[PDB]
Amino acid sequence: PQITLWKRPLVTIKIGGQLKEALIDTGADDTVIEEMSLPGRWKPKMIGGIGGFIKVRQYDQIIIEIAGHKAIGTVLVGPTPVNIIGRNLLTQIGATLNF
Amino acid sequence: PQITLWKRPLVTIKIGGQLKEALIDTGADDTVIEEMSLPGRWKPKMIGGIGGFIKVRQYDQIIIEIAGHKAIGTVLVGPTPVNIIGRNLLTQIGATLNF
Ligand SMILES: CCCC[C@@H](CN[C@@H](CCCC)C(=O)N[C@@H](CCC(N)=O)C(=O)N[C@@H](CCCNC(N)=[NH2+])C(N)=O)NC(=O)[C@@H](NC(=O)[C@@H](NC(C)=O)[C@@H](C)O)[C@@H](C)CC
Numbered sequence: 001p002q003i004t005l006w007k008r009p010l011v012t013i014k015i016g017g018q019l020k021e022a023l024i025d026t027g028a029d030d031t032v033i034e035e036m037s038l039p040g041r042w043k044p045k046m047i048g049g050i051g052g053f054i055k056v057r058q059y060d061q062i063i064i065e066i067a068g069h070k071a072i073g074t075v076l077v078g079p080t081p082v083n084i085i086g087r088n089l090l091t092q093i094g095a096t097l098n099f
Numbered sequence: 100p101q102i103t104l105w106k107r108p109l110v111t112i113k114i115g116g117q118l119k120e121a122l123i124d125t126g127a128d129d130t131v132i133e134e135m136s137l138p139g140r141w142k143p144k145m146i147g148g149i150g151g152f153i154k155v156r157q158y159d160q161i162i163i164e165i166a167g168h169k170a171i172g173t174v175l176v177g178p179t180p181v182n183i184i185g186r187n188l189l190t191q192i193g194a195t196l197n198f
Contacts, residue, residue, distance in 0.1 A: 003196040005186040009125050024196055026108050027124025027183060032149070049149020050131070050179060069198065080149055084126055087104040095198040097102040097123055099168065099189075 001067070013085065014065040015075065020083055022066075026097055028086030031064075032076045038062060045076060054079055069093040100166070112184065113164040114174065119182050121165075125196060127185030130163075131175045137161055144175060153177055168192040 003009045009024040016036060030047065042057040056078030064071050066085055071092040102108045108123040115137050129146060141156040155177030162171050165184055170191035 001198065005125060005189045005194060005196075008128070008186070009196055023126050025124070025126030026104060026196070027122050027126050029107070047149060048180060050146060050183075051148055051152050052150030054149055067198075081147060082126075087107075090104045090198075093198050095104060095196055097104070097108055097125075097194055098197050099100065099166075099192050099194040 011067040022083035025084040028084045030086045032080040033083045110166040121182035121184045124183045130185045131179045131183045
């Protein structure tokens with residue numbers, strides 16, 4: 001699709017069989033989701049945002065759908081204010097910015 | 100242009116007579132710039148994201164040129180770790196997300 005920016009670019013995602021809302025975020029390197037259970041082992045990661053740094057859990061090779069488009073990749077889980085879909089998965093679905 | 104998302108989408112902006120580099124952030128409601136002088140009255144604002152909140156100064160009716168495209172709107176100034184172009188200005192330059 002084409003998504004304009006007059007409103008927040010919120011989409012539905014599917015992860016772990018569950019539908020969630022998330023923000024398409026070109027300003028995010030990574031994909032960060034609120035607390036949930038994911039399978040397998042995780043590794044530690046520190047990430048930064050507008051207000052400082054937080055610790056998250058890094059899960060690799062997670063199956064995720066973004067607005068109906070299939071991706072398989074890294075998902076960070078931790079105390080983000082909002083679920084964000086970042087560039088690691090936006091590149092898998094072929095997303096670009098255009099003006 | 101078409102901007103891919105393999106790397107951070109950085110652009111040059113001109114604001115207040117100065118050139119700066121800034122991140123195109125579809126996940127940002129507002130435009131947030133590191134400390135600089137701007138004309139006119141301001142009022143304080145708290146803005147949040149990963150890591151919590153920072154205090155900024157809100158300036159209205161600021162003219163800005165983003166990768167060569169002129170727009171006018173509100174600009175927030177304060178201790179942001181990165182200069183951010185948010186949706187309030189991205190709409191004005193006609194920026195969309197496409198996949
Ligand atoms: C979580 C809230 C929504 C998404 C977030 C994305 N902003 C980018 C800004 C760029 C960094 C300061 C971000 O945090 N990106 C992170 C996301 C986490 C991630 N890992 O992907 C990032 O890429 N972090 C990199 C570090 C980038 C460093 N950059 C640099 N040195 N130049 C990282 N690997 O940790 N938006 C925001 O932080 C904005 N928040 C908002 O728009 C709204 N706030 C809330 C809470 O929704 C509004 C109600 O204020 C701020 C700027 C105010 C207008």
